[PDB]
Design a protein around this ligand. Structure first.
Ligand SMILES: [Mg+2]
Ligand SMILES: [Mg+2]
Ligand SMILES: [Mg+2]
Ligand SMILES: [Mg+2]
Ligand SMILES: [Zn+2]
Ligand SMILES: [Zn+2]
Lengths: 184, 365, 365, 184
DNA sequence: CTAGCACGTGC
DNA sequence: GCACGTG
DNA sequence: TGCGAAATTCCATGACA
DNA sequence: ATTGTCATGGAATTTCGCA
DNA sequence: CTAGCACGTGC
DNA sequence: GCACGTG
DNA sequence: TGCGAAATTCCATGACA
DNA sequence: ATTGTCATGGAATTTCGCA
């Protein structure tokens, strides 16, 4: 009955393995439920350690009341449970094989996978240096349901980097073929 | 020569008539209530004042008192200060006795991310291989990011700021003229991102007051947290960052976190006044909070201060003088007055230089 | 437990009656004009204040504002300052916000040779193998003797002073607690001659103000005389000594030479007012001059200063704190109050120690 | 017609050679004419150099209008003349073989030679360390003609080291014999 | 940005 | 490498 | 519409350099 | 072309609970 | 008591 | 030698 | 018993640490 | 058991030469 707020819920998940970029292989995805704000941390493994290393950074900024994830091994470990308990964070798991978040979080997360894959095309190995730009883009693009960007909802101001261009996010013809060759 | 008139009994402007001016031992002399004094010819006075001043390079009175031992003439001090004004060594060695004007108190940035203030702390005791901390303070909120580094380099600053600017890009970053921040490498990194670099006048940490003051708090917390324990701070940085970002500023009645996001996160003693409002209602409440913040005003001037004027002769303090060397450069001219505390001078090396008035004295005489 | 009375509707001193105190989620709660707050049982409050304070070791208001987010109870701040008073880390790390009292201005010594003030200047740039200068200033006159040495040792001080004390023996020699002056060797040398040694409170150069201030003049003259010339000062010492001993002090209207001997020697611009008097007439004129010298008075106190009281809890500033370490020792007690600016304390190592109040803060809370 | 003053005239002279004391052989004697105040500097030679070294020290304290001496080689040199001229000091010489000063300066100088010789008896080689005491003694003992000590006349105050004891200054019997042996 | 040097003193 | 400007 | 005390605000001080 | 700052704790002032 | 370190920049 | 207290 | 200007005194400021 | 100081130069005040 209370209106949703930032820091109410962080939706976390791993993406990968990706092609190696400066020795990194995975992306940890953190999405704030209320605002759609996304943090992306690169890791070497979908492990409790990497998760803890990265989230220890994020939680120096802000601590969520709740973290939500799939039943991934990194998030179901005892170590991760004790980590969360120490910081007063409640852990929440979706039942196995039935991932669930919200329309907003399903849509941002879809955007992420698609945005990552589009830039990963010519640059299979240079994705590390691009994580800042990705994150800025996602966070400065206008929601369908509400009129505001995530940035707007989190900070209560315009951004100094407004992504005026919505682009295609779909693959072009030349991109599709040079991406098909990536395997062969 | 022009003293002949006196011995005869004629009058000349400057020499009072009621005095008796006689001749002894080849010299023109006068009887004065302090005793009998020698009156030298105008052509000899400039050298007398020079000799007296040079004994110990004394200022006005201490120079006058020497001369007055043997001599009298009209307007002695006028001749004395003429000398003082031309003694290169006194001008570049003597202290100022004029205080700087009252400090400015620049408007708080309007929005978060408008202006960042940055600085390096250290060296610190080596901790897990690390020696320095990059402190980034957002002007409006005070929200502060701490990054541990192995050196105060551009390269470590870039790496650190690439992480930070994943959240948001600032309009401006202000720093001191640390080599790390003045490199063309950092110039380009900032240009590429549309960030304008703004620099403190040199040798004037006041100008990074926002971040410097934050350094104080960081160190004070670290210190306390390390009492009776070896000084290994690397693991404590995140704790301190978070702690300070959530600490109330009694004068504001808000934490920099609260000023950044408009709501506490899940930290101890989280404020929950706004639990019943929608985020929208919360954000507009935040908007009023940000605009209604207390802004301090410049203090009253001191009884004997100076404010610089275009065209004024002025002297920049020698940054780092060697032992037994002057503390001031030669006189320079005020080219432009940026505000009552900042000035452009054509400096001793013949370049336009922006300087704080605290690093200046007005040339005297 | 004692909160049961409230829920029922009974009254207890400290809890205003016009408020409604209900129960939710196992906790006793009150409706207040700032919102609904939790009232903890007295047995839980001491630990709540501890938790809130410890997040960033905040003082009164910044601690209160955290607690106030979730809780209310009568006289919250009384409990808060109780905590602040018992936090060892805040007491030994926090700065004072109380200024020292007004400085004393001790009576000028009556006679020459009553009190000498001594000090070492240096290291200086090596000049003819020499690195330091022993500065000896006679309190009454200001007459100053400069001795060049290769080290600030007792042995060089003795040698230097054997030369000086061939002219005359002083009653007292005052110095800082430099190793050269606190050695038992120098203790014996002084005892043998009937000279009483008097020492400044530690880390308080103010107390050797007479000689320190003279160091300023020495250096300023040396500097000027060495402009655009390599800094070789050894040969200039005698010149400077003589120059300064014959320099007028505008406020006094006399040179330290004149105050020493009552007559100029054969130096440039020698004063000769007394040429007609016998030495006897001259000496009694000197006697009146010495007694009639201007004596400055203590300034007005600052709006928020402290003066120490016997029995007061007080903290000595840590002389030379390591990086990230506290700047204050644990609280100590004022044993004796020598004057409103000097105090004896039983120090942190369990010894009687004489200290300047500038190196003290009153323990707060 | 003007009354005599301190710094009006310094009477200088050498005493020695003495037995070597910390490598020193001579004493330069400086007596202020008006006050009787004595400075004594040890030297290695009765040379212009030694004279200049020592007097450069004394003249950092006070400069005499006039220095007076016998026609000793150290004081008649060109170098010494230029030295004096640079400092505005007039040099004055007694005609050769007719030394002349004043009753006061003749008497102090006699005191010096006698005081030095008395302490030089048991201590032919330790006289260097004693020069301070000698100087203090001479300067703190009451004049016959006037009631004041030199110290008194120079500084206008009592001394903190009043030499209440006038001693013998004459030699004792044991002193005379151990001094006669000094040669053999 | 803070480090180091100097001396005398006491295991 | 090395001297300078700024922290 | 007034009193005593607690709560709040004021603000000199010092340390970041 | 750039510019001091703010936590701290006694003290001064205001607010509040109760008549 | 003052020295030194650090970086980036320009012969 | 080495650690400390003061400049 | 007054005016203008020169002479003197006043005193905040900074550097010795 | 010990304690700030004083040169400096604009500004404020006083003194002085002349009516
Ligand atoms: Mg997954
Ligand atoms: Mg800096
Ligand atoms: Mg000292
Ligand atoms: Mg002879
Ligand atoms: Zn000069
Ligand atoms: Zn604390």
């Amino acid at each position: 009955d209370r209106p949703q707020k930032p820091f109410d819920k962080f939706f976390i998940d791993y993406i990968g393995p990706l092609p190696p970029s400066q020795g990194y292989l995975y992306v940890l995805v953190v999405v704030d439920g209320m605002t759609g704000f996304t943090w992306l941390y690169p890791t070497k493994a979908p492990s409790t350690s990497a998760t803890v290393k990265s989230l220890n950074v994020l939680t120096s900024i802000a601590i969520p009341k709740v973290i939500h994830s799939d039943q991934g091994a990194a998030f179901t470990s005892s170590t991760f449970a004790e980590w969360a308990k120490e910081r007063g964070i409640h852990l929440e798991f979706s039942t196995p094989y039935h991932p669930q978040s919200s329309g907003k979080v399903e849509r941002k997360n879809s955007d992420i996978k698609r945005l990552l894959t589009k830039l990963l095309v010519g640059r299979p190995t240079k994705w590390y240096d691009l994580l800042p730009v990705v994150q800025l883009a996602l966070n400065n693009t206008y929601s369908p349901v509400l009129k505001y960007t995530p940035h707007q909802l989190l900070f209560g101001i315009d951004s100094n980097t407004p992504f005026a261009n919505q682009d295609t996010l779909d693959l072009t013809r030349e991109e599709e073929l040079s991406l098909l060759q990536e395997i062969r | 020569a022009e003293l002949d008139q006196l011995l005869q009994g004629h009058y000349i402007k400057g020499y009072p008539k009621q005095y008796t001016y006689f001749l002894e031992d080849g010299k023109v002399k006068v009887s004065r209530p302090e005793g009998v004094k020698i009156i030298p010819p105008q052509s000899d006075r400039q050298k007398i004042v020079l000799q007296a001043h040079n004994l110990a390079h004394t200022g006005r009175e201490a120079t006058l008192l020497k001369i007055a031992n043997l001599y009298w003439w009209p307007n002695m001090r006028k001749d004395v200060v003429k000398q003082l004004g031309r003694c290169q060594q006194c001008l570049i060695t003597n202290a100022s006795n004029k205080a700087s004007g009252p400090i400015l108190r620049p408007d708080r940035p309007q929005k978060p991310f408008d202006k960042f203030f940055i600085d390096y702390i250290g060296p610190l005791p080596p901790s897990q291989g690390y020696l320095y901390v990059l402190v980034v303070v957002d002007g409006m909120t005070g929200f502060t990011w701490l990054y541990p580094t192995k050196a105060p380099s551009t390269s470590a600053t870039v790496k650190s700021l690439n992480v930070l600017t994943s959240i948001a890009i600032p309009k401006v970053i202000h720093s001191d003229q640390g080599a790390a921040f003045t490199s063309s490498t950092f110039a380009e990194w900032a240009k590429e991102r549309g960030i304008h670099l703004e620099f403190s006048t040199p040798y004037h940490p006041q100008s990074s007051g926002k971040v410097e003051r934050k350094n104080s708090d960081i160190k004070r917390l670290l210190t306390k947290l390390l009492v009776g324990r070896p000084t290994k701070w690397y693991d404590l940085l995140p704790v301190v960052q978070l702690a300070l970002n959530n600490t109330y500023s009694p004068v504001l009645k808000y934490t920099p976190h609260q000023l950044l996001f408009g709501i506490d996160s899940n930290t101890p003693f989280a404020n929950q006044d706004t639990l019943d409002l929608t985020r929208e209602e919360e954000l507009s409440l935040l908007q009023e909070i940000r605009t209604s913040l207390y802004h301090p005003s410049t203090p009253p001037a001191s009884s004997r201060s100076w404010s610089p004027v275009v065209g004024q002769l002025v002297q920049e303090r020698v940054a780092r003088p060697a032992s037994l060397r002057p503390r001031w450069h030669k006189p320079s001219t005020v080219l432009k007055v940026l505000n009552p505390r900042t000035v452009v001078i054509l400096d001793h090396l013949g370049n336009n230089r922006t300087v704080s008035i605290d690093n200046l004295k007005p040339t005297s005489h």
